[PDB]
Each structure stands twice: as C-alpha cells, then as structure tokens.
Amino acid sequence: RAQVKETCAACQKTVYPMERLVADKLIFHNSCFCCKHCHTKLSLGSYAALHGEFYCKPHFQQLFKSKGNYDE
C-alpha cells in the first residue's frame, strides 16, 4: 500500500520521505526529474513538465512547442 511508500514517476523508484517531493502532482525524488531529451537535472526551480516527460524549457520549446520561456 502507498502511504509511506511513494513510487516515483520520474525514475519509477520508491521515494523515501526526505526525497519525496511532489511536482505537478507527481510524487518523486527531488533529485531525479531531468529532461527526457537531455539528462539535465532541471528538478525543482526551473523546469518544464509534460504528461509523461519532464523536459527542459529549451527542449520543451523546440521539440514540443509548448511552454519553455527562456527570455522567450
């Protein structure tokens, strides 16, 4: 049962309490969510997330043409 056993969506590993963060309602390690095109550790601070994939703002703009915003 998931109570104190959260499973991560950015690396699918069970997240431990200190690392258990919730970005965009997805529960994961604060340390793991990187861009799906480049393993850029964009975790918590400046990131662009999409259903399924976490993307860096530059790649998100080019590849998905969704958000990004890097003085753009």
| Residue in 14, 38, 44, 70 binding Zn ion, rule: CB under 5 A | 38
Q: Which residue has the tokens 């999409």?
A: 50
| Candidate ranges 43-51, 52-60, 63-71; the one touching Zn ion (CB under 5 A) | 52-60
Q: Which residue has the tokens 């799906």?
A: 36
| Residue in 4, 11, 22, 44 binding Zn ion, rule: CB under 5 A | 11
| Residue in 6, 21, 29, 57 binding Zn ion, rule: CB under 5 A | 29
Instruction: Provide the terminal-to-terminal Cα distance of the chain, rounded to the nearest Å.
Output: 44
Taking CB atoms within 8 Å and a gap of at least 24, the contacts of 4-8 are 8/32
Is 28 a residue that touches Zn ion (CB under 5 A)?
A: yes
